[PDB]
PDB file of C-alpha atoms in Angstrom:
ATOM      1  CA  UNK A   1     -53.236  86.261  10.544  1.00  0.00           C
ATOM      2  CA  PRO A   2     -50.624  86.100  12.701  1.00  0.00           C
ATOM      3  CA  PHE A   3     -48.292  84.517  11.377  1.00  0.00           C
ATOM      4  CA  UNK A   4     -45.074  84.407   8.881  1.00  0.00           C
ATOM      5  CA  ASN A   5     -43.007  88.121   8.701  1.00  0.00           C
ATOM      6  CA  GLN A   6     -44.154  91.018   6.708  1.00  0.00           C
ATOM      7  CA  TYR A   7     -43.239  89.086   3.361  1.00  0.00           C
ATOM      8  CA  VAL A   8     -45.301  86.107   3.838  1.00  0.00           C
ATOM      9  CA  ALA A   9     -48.191  86.370   6.258  1.00  0.00           C
ATOM     10  CA  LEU A  10     -51.043  83.916   7.101  1.00  0.00           C
TER      11      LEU A  10
ATOM     12  CA  UNK B   1     -44.397  90.702  -1.370  1.00  0.00           C
ATOM     13  CA  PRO B   2     -46.082  93.628  -2.986  1.00  0.00           C
ATOM     14  CA  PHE B   3     -49.599  91.649  -3.408  1.00  0.00           C
ATOM     15  CA  UNK B   4     -52.404  91.258  -0.631  1.00  0.00           C
ATOM     16  CA  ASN B   5     -53.177  92.672   2.346  1.00  0.00           C
ATOM     17  CA  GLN B   6     -51.926  93.213   6.113  1.00  0.00           C
ATOM     18  CA  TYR B   7     -53.634  89.432   6.935  1.00  0.00           C
ATOM     19  CA  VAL B   8     -52.578  87.180   3.964  1.00  0.00           C
ATOM     20  CA  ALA B   9     -49.482  88.867   2.050  1.00  0.00           C
ATOM     21  CA  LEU B  10     -47.054  87.362  -0.661  1.00  0.00           C
TER      22      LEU B  10
END
């Protein structure tokens, strides 16, 4: 979702 | 990484 980065996103 | 979508990305 709106958390993480462009590599690991949730 | 280069898998998933813009919401759940690995």
